[PDB]
Design a protein around this nucleic acid. Sequence first.
DNA 1: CCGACTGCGCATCAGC
DNA 2: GCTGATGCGC
DNA 3: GTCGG
Length: 326
Amino acid sequence: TLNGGITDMLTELANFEKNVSQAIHKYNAYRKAASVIAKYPHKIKSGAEAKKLPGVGTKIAEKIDEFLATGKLRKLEKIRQDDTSSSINFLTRVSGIGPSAARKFVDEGIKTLEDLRKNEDKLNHHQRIGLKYFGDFEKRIPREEMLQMQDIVLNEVKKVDSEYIATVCGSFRRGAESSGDMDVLLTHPSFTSESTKQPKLLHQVVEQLQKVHFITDTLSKGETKFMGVCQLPSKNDEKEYPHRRIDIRLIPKDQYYCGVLYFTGSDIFNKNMRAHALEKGFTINEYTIRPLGVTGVAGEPLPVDSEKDIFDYIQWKYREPKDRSE
DNA sequence: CCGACTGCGCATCAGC
DNA sequence: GCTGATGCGC
DNA sequence: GTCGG
Ligand SMILES: Nc1ncnc2c1ncn2[C@H]1C[C@H](O)[C@@H](COP(=O)(O)OP(=O)(O)[C@H](Cl)P(=O)(O)O)O1
Ligand SMILES: [Cl-]
Ligand SMILES: [Cl-]
Ligand SMILES: [Mg+2]
Ligand code: NA
Ligand code: NA
Ligand code: NA
């Protein structure tokens, strides 16, 4: 990629501030800076040039000057040498371990992958499954496997009830050649903003996917969100596929377009789009777009009949999923 | 300068 | 138990 | 850490 050095540097700084400093705004600021530079269709030749971009200010511009001149950042060099920082950054790579638990473990002398395996009784359930599939969860998913996975999920959902609709979102819907996980949007005519005519709607789908050994583990589960682990079946003598993260989101069917807009992302595109909505006087979530009145209180849901309607409200030209990879 | 920074489900904990 | 805050991940 | 007002 065109400014890969700079965006990697900024991502490492973002990870440091979230994981180690526990400074969530610095984290979001670095990620915004990285995203706008990754977008920029010119090889950046100075910090001043990059400062022209929205979300690059004085401090990042100076870091960019250091990096272009020397190929590195002293601040990052030091972070990498610091044992406490390095240990906490590593521990947050386990799904379910964040900045707080990572620092808790390191304070206790639990600093390595071995230390976790030796201390499984100190992990909650999510962290336990994350440790178990730590290696698997580092591997990306080729689109060819996502297509197999899509085909399994959609057919099994159909066998539970043919009125379900399951839509694979995330990077897959944006056309990516590889995905980090599988995100499935689900709807059913019984569950709308106005009524829930049948419960267990998500449960029945999860149960059927466990029955056929597609879903292998559960990280968390509720009435509308499932987060867990799945695996493609392998053939005779074939090495097994890696285990994969899967998230299933049950959205009221009349709220499908806000739901699919949300679950298609990217996360930074969503953040940017919701920022713009506020500037235009609306608030967007995965259910509705609503105005902000005189008090900045969210009013009543606006009528939405397409993803593009959402764009129309905030005065953005429609962007196809493949152009939302920010 | 400096207040605001996207929005929310599920798990866990704390205080009653 | 419930409620609200926090942790974590999406 | 950045920025609109
Ligand atoms: N912090 C956030 N704020 C708003 N929307 C978010 C969000 N995080 C995620 N979403 C929305 C927007 C996301 O697109 C959707 C899925 O989240 P996933 O973490 O799986 O992101 P992806 O795009 O699929 C990644 Cl490129 P990969 O999974 O291939 O590694 O959820
Ligand atoms: Cl901060
Ligand atoms: Cl809502
Ligand atoms: Mg995803
Ligand atoms: Na700027
Ligand atoms: Na983690
Ligand atoms: Na996900």
